Enzyme design. Structure first.
Site, PDB file in Angstrom:
ATOM      1  CG  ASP A   1      -1.254   8.782   1.062  1.00  0.00           C
ATOM      2  OD1 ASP A   1      -0.998   7.545   0.977  1.00  0.00           O
ATOM      3  OD2 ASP A   1      -1.000   9.620   0.179  1.00  0.00           O
TER       4      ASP A   1
ATOM      5  CD  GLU B   1       3.286   3.635   3.261  1.00  0.00           C
ATOM      6  OE1 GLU B   1       2.083   3.293   3.062  1.00  0.00           O
ATOM      7  OE2 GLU B   1       3.736   4.809   3.035  1.00  0.00           O
TER       8      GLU B   1
HETATM    9  O1  LIG Z   1      -1.791  12.194  -2.254  1.00  0.00           O
HETATM   10  C1  LIG Z   1      -1.409  11.732  -3.550  1.00  0.00           C
HETATM   11  C2  LIG Z   1      -1.484  10.212  -3.653  1.00  0.00           C
HETATM   12  C3  LIG Z   1      -1.075   9.796  -5.094  1.00  0.00           C
HETATM   13  C4  LIG Z   1       0.377  10.101  -5.393  1.00  0.00           C
HETATM   14  C5  LIG Z   1       0.804   9.566  -6.785  1.00  0.00           C
HETATM   15  C6  LIG Z   1       2.173   9.451  -7.076  1.00  0.00           C
HETATM   16  C7  LIG Z   1       2.611   8.964  -8.311  1.00  0.00           C
HETATM   17  C8  LIG Z   1       1.674   8.589  -9.281  1.00  0.00           C
HETATM   18  C9  LIG Z   1       0.320   8.722  -9.016  1.00  0.00           C
HETATM   19  C10 LIG Z   1      -0.106   9.252  -7.780  1.00  0.00           C
HETATM   20  N1  LIG Z   1      -0.557   9.677  -2.628  1.00  0.00           N
HETATM   21  C11 LIG Z   1      -0.580   8.199  -2.572  1.00  0.00           C
HETATM   22  C12 LIG Z   1      -1.991   7.687  -2.285  1.00  0.00           C
HETATM   23  O2  LIG Z   1      -1.944   6.254  -2.210  1.00  0.00           O
HETATM   24  C13 LIG Z   1      -2.968   8.173  -3.323  1.00  0.00           C
HETATM   25  O3  LIG Z   1      -4.325   7.818  -3.002  1.00  0.00           O
HETATM   26  C14 LIG Z   1      -2.871   9.696  -3.374  1.00  0.00           C
HETATM   27  O4  LIG Z   1      -3.802  10.205  -4.321  1.00  0.00           O
END
Ligand SMILES: OC[C@@]1(CCc2ccccc2)NC[C@H](O)[C@@H](O)[C@@H]1O
Ligand SMILES: *[C@@H]1O[C@H](CO)[C@@H](O[C@@H]2O[C@H](CO)[C@@H](O[C@@H]3O[C@H](CO)[C@@H](O)[C@H](O)[C@@H]3O)[C@H](O)[C@H]2NC(C)=O)[C@H](O)[C@H]1NC(C)=O
Ligand SMILES: *[C@@H]1O[C@H](CO)[C@@H](O[C@@H]2O[C@H](CO)[C@@H](O[C@@H]3O[C@H](CO)[C@@H](O)[C@H](O)[C@@H]3O)[C@H](O)[C@H]2NC(C)=O)[C@H](O)[C@H]1NC(C)=O
Ligand SMILES: *[C@@H]1O[C@H](CO[C@@H]2O[C@@H](C)[C@@H](O)[C@@H](O)[C@@H]2O)[C@@H](O[C@@H]2O[C@H](CO)[C@@H](O)[C@H](O)[C@H]2NC(C)=O)[C@H](O)[C@H]1NC(C)=O
Ligand SMILES: *[C@@H]1O[C@H](CO)[C@@H](O[C@@H]2O[C@H](CO)[C@@H](O)[C@H](O)[C@H]2NC(C)=O)[C@H](O)[C@H]1NC(C)=O
Ligand SMILES: *[C@@H]1O[C@H](CO[C@@H]2O[C@@H](C)[C@@H](O)[C@@H](O)[C@@H]2O)[C@@H](O)[C@H](O)[C@H]1NC(C)=O
Ligand SMILES: [Cl-]
Ligand SMILES: [Cl-]
Ligand SMILES: [Cl-]
Ligand SMILES: [Cl-]
Ligand SMILES: [Cl-]
Length: 842
Positions: free
Chosen positions: A421, A424
């Site tokens: 994750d 970027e």
């Molecule tokens: O690791 C946490 C997470 C979600 C973070 C988030 C921030 C603001 C609002 C909601 C979620 N990072 C982004 C990923 O694309 C998602 O799959 C993952 O669960």
């Protein structure tokens, strides 16, 4: 000279708002639009490069390009070198470079004819067979400055697809559209640069031929489409490195593109099972309860995931000693029940711990693995653990350090893959904790249409140092370089096929990893938008792709979760994932009727896994798509060109989902031929006889429409709650006969996870043929892996009259049923995939 039709006007002020006086001072035409279309545009006489000293070599063509009048951008490169390479009968390759200076380059009869315009310079590429003009770069000036390249062409039609990652129809709008490639963490929304960048398009031609164009450039870019129709590549750096792929079939264009960037990797069979994750499974006890609750309600689950919950203070390569004290035992237990385990990994490494307390940082610092700043220290940003440094995956020492951190963590907790994750790379602050310097990389002369209006927004400084180049040139490769490093790390740690799922991507990502579409809302609009996005990634060679089933952000509804599970069971990568503050959306958390509909969707996917695995084999060996748009399979039927709310698996399985609330029916396009309702196969018209037309189908909430193309045989396998169980079941054939009584299919089988299977011949390949009331197998290769495969059922669709007798190897069968209403012949057999059989009826 300024008498240029409006749709053919090319923007002479892409860089800023401009007055008639400034426009005319640049040597450009000023004509206001009567209502987007540029007011300031290039006359046909605007100064370009002149072609000089064109010569022919065994390599192809070479020339000098000379600009005599400077552009309005700083640092024009007035002398360029053109190299044209005729590489294959289907692939033309040309580069435009600075002969005096090495510029950044991305680390990676014929069907065409080529001619050149001398002044203004252009490259013209014809399809030889019909003389269609595919490329013509004479339509606008060539710009080649240190931080601004622009190359334009006419397009052969209004139909163009590619240029990921964006939330859009599969066919891009040519109505003055700006598409920005700059990897960015943002919840998918239209008109925005999202997580990945794929500078490739496929353009359709009247008649159903197609070509593709790849610009091998990883800089921030805008691609501008206009309705003439025409396209302009506008990059902030690098060189012009262009590939043209002559097709002529859209499926051939995709294969030819993948011959340059790499064929998709072969996933392990278990990766095609059902995956379940959320942020908020905050202990091993809760995580185990997910598997228990799925099992109790008879829901297949191959892979249990955890998000940031497992970590100690949201740090990679750690696990907390509260909820996750017995993390190693939980993962060993999943393995003992025949399941795998996946967990999130972030790129950024906590930099704030006491020295010697956090090996990933301490060892990173010792080996110099991190992206550095202007004073040669690690660039510090802010992500989950707080202050972090960012690994430089272009540094060979960082690759060795990443392999070691992964193998050391794997010795503690035997995870089966990595969910990468935030690559970027994503930064919670702008640039760094120390800001960014004021230089031409941070503040370039042309800034593409990125969210936030700066290359620094939600990421690290553009002038930061990596081993191969500055971040300015490498940013769009960050995720791809981490996917490579993680693919290698997992091969070395486990010695079997890796399973990497990445957020950020670049062209050629599919050679190493899969992708999920990111932080999609739990909305009907995002359900619908997922179909074109999954199809787009298949065309770009990342067939292992899906969206978070039932949506990620906000709260799903029961109805939306049923429809999303139904369509999501046809994502090549199928995971249900959910955000921290959401209501639960595991299949077992819904009403009994919603559970039955979700269980049927999962059962059907598991029954099709031998077929889906075979489709992945064809992607891996021949550059085929897995999920494909109707226009890839039926390109000569122009009605398919705008269809992106239906999909095929391979050539033969047509999926027509309900994508709106409160619907009990759906209208889908059926190409010319017979389409059998898959509901007539043991696991509403029995057959749609289409002339090429739209058909309204019943679609109650417990149903998704799936049709099998006449002429195709699909292998199926019996049920299981895991692929460990399902792979031991007997198999079946679904045989969809043409009106003339013919059909063909295939099965690829191996051990499901070893490396170098194709190189070592450790597989079985079987072809199935129906002709003249007989079904046979043809043994292409049989080895130990597939010799034990048992065939128990043969279901034959389109059998016009009830048979008197059914024979298996010349002996009457113990049991068969014929339905005169559905024209299905269902045959019980005891045969082996890997031994020649002959089934017959009359
Ligand atoms: O690791 C946490 C997470 C979600 C973070 C988030 C921030 C603001 C609002 C909601 C979620 N990072 C982004 C990923 O694309 C998602 O799959 C993952 O669960
Ligand atoms: C590739 O694109 C270029 C630029 O659009 C095309 O060149 C242009 O072709 C037009 C139409 O043929 C030319 O206009 C014509 O010019 C002649 C001679 O002056 C004039 O008598 C006609 O009335 C007509 O207006 C134009 O000069 C020419 N432009 C340039 C920059 O050369 C070209 O046709 C395209 N190539 C292919 C194969 O499509
Ligand atoms: C390049 O990155 C390094 C970090 O690797 C940056 O170092 C940071 O420098 C600032 C000062 O410019 C330090 O702030 C100082 O911190 C102390 C408290 O620890 C405080 O007493 C001072 O008033 C000041 O705020 C900061 O601590 C330091 N970061 C770390 C992690 O040491 C460096 O500035 C970067 N260079 C450029 C030009 O951006
Ligand atoms: C285009 O090429 C000409 C000729 O260059 C020569 O022939 C080539 C095949 C190769 O062998 C070159 O190295 C040769 O020099 C260039 O015109 C020459 O320019 C040089 C340097 O100014 C000069 O000494 C010669 O007298 C010129 N020769 C002739 C016959 O004019 C020309 O500069 C090249 N054009 C561009 C824009 O690069
Ligand atoms: C697994 O399912 C169990 C049983 O439904 C869930 O535990 C129940 O949850 C309710 C709320 O819906 C609690 O108030 C009850 O006390 C629980 N019942 C029992 C029998 O324990 C549990 O939450 C589920 N776990 C997960 C992770 O989904
Ligand atoms: C998602 O839902 C959360 C809890 O909502 C509560 O329970 C559900 C079943 C409904 O009855 C609802 O009306 C209750 O408030 C909310 O706290 C959360 O904000 C919701 N998220 C969004 C973004 O709407
Ligand atoms: Cl460089
Ligand atoms: Cl390859
Ligand atoms: Cl180097
Ligand atoms: Cl037919
Ligand atoms: Cl038999």
């Amino acid at each position: 000279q300024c008498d240029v039709p409006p749709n053919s006007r090319f923007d002479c002020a892409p860089d800023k708002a401009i007055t008639q006086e400034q426009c005319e001072a640049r040597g450009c035409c000023y004509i206001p639009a009567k209502q987007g279309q540029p007011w300031c545009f290039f006359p046909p006489s605007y100064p370009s490069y002149k072609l000089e000293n064109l010569s022919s070599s065994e390599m192809g063509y070479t020339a000098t390009l000379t600009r005599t009048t400077p552009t309005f951008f700083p640092k024009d490169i007035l002398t360029l070198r053109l190299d044209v390479m005729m590489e294959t009968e289907n692939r033309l390759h040309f580069t435009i470079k600075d002969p005096a200076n090495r510029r950044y380059e991305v680390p990676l009869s014929p069907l065409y004819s080529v001619e050149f315009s001398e002044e203004p310079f252009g490259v013209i590429v014809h399809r030889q067979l019909d003389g269609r003009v595919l490329l013509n770069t004479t339509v606008a000036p060539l710009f080649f400055a240190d931080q601004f390249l622009q190359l334009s062409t006419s397009l052969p039609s209004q139909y163009i697809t590619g240029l990921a990652e964006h939330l859009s129809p599969l066919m891009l709008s040519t109505s003055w559209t700006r598409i920005t490639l700059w990897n960015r963490d943002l919840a998918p929304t239209p008109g925005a640069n999202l997580y990945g960048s794929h500078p490739f398009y496929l353009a359709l031609e009247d008649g159903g031929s197609a070509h593709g164009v790849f610009l091998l450039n990883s800089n921030a870019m805008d691609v501008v489409l206009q309705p003439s129709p025409a396209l302009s590549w506008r990059s902030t750096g690098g060189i012009l490195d262009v590939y043209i792929f002559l097709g002529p079939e859209p499926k051939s264009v995709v294969q030819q593109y993948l011959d340059v960037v790499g064929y998709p990797f072969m996933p392990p069979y278990w990766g095609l099972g059902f995956h379940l994750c959320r942020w908020g499974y905050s202990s091993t006890a809760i995580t185990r309860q997910v598997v228990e609750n799925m099992t109790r309600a008879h829901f297949p689950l191959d892979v249990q995931w955890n998000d940031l919950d497992y970590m100690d203070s949201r740090r990679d390569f750690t696990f907390n000693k509260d909820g996750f004290r017995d993390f190693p035992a939980m993962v060993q237990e999943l393995h003992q029940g025949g399941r795998r385990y996946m967990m999130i990994v972030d790129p950024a490494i906590s930099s704030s711990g006491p020295a010697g307390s956090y090996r990933p940082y301490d060892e990173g610092l010792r080996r110099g693995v991190f992206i550095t700043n202007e004073t040669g220290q690690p660039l510090i940003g802010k992500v989950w653990p707080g202050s972090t440094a960012f690994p430089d995956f272009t540094n060979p020492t960082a690759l060795a350090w990443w392999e070691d951190m992964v193998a050391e963590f794997h010795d503690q907790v035997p995870f089966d893959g990595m969910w990468i994750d935030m690559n970027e790379p994503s930064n919670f602050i702008r640039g760094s904790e120390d800001g960014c310097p004021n230089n031409e990389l941070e503040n370039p002369p042309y800034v593409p249409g990125v969210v936030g209006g700066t290359l620094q927004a939600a990421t690290i400084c553009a002038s930061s140092h990596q081993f191969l180049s500055t971040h300015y040139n490498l940013h769009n490769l960050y995720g791809l370089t981490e996917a490579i490093a993680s693919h290698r790390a997992l091969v070395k740690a486990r010695g079997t096929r890796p399973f990497v799922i990445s957020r950020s991507t670049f062209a050629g990502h599919g050679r190493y990893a899969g992708h999920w579409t990111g932080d999609v809302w739990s909305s009907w609009e995002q359900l619908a938008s997922s179909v074109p996005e999954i199809l787009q990634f298949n065309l770009l060679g990342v067939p292992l792709v899906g969206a978070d089933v039932c949506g990620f952000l906000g709260n799903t509804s029961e109805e939306l979760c049923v429809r999303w599970t139904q369509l999501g069971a046809f994502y090549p990568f199928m995971r249900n994932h959910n955000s921290l503050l959401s209501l639960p959306q595991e299949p077992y958390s819904f009403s009994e009727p919603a559970q039955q509909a979700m269980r049927k969707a999962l059962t059907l996917r598991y029954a099709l896994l031998p077929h889906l695995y075979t489709l992945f084999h064809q992607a891996h060996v021949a550059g085929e798509t897995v999920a494909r748009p109707l226009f890839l399979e039926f390109p000569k039927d122009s009605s398919t060109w705008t269809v992106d709310h239906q999909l095929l698996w391979g050539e033969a399985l047509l999926i027509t989902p309900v994508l709106q609330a409160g619907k009990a029916e759906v209208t889908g396009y059926f190409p010319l031929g017979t389409w059998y309702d898959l509901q007539t196969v043991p696991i509403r018209e029995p057959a749609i006889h289409s002339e090429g037309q739209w058909v309204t189908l019943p679609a109650p909430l417990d149903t998704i429409n799936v049709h099998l193309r006449a002429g195709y045989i699909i292998p199926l396998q019996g049920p299981g709650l895991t692929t460990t169980e399902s792979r031991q079941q007997p198999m079946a054939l679904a045989v969809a006969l043409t009106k003339g009584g013919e059909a063909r299919g295939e099965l690829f089988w191996d051990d499901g996870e070893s490396l170098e299977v194709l190189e070592r011949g450790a597989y079985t390949q079987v072809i199935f043929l129906a002709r003249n009331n007989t079904i046979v197998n043809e043994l292409v290769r049989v080895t130990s892996e597939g010799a034990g495969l048992q065939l128990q059922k043969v279901t034959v669709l389109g059998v016009a009259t009830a048979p008197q007798q059914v024979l298996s190897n010349g002996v009457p069968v113990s049991n068969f049923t014929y339905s005169p209403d559905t024209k299905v012949l269902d045959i019980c057999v005891s045969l082996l995939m890997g031994e020649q059989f002959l089934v017959s009826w009359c």
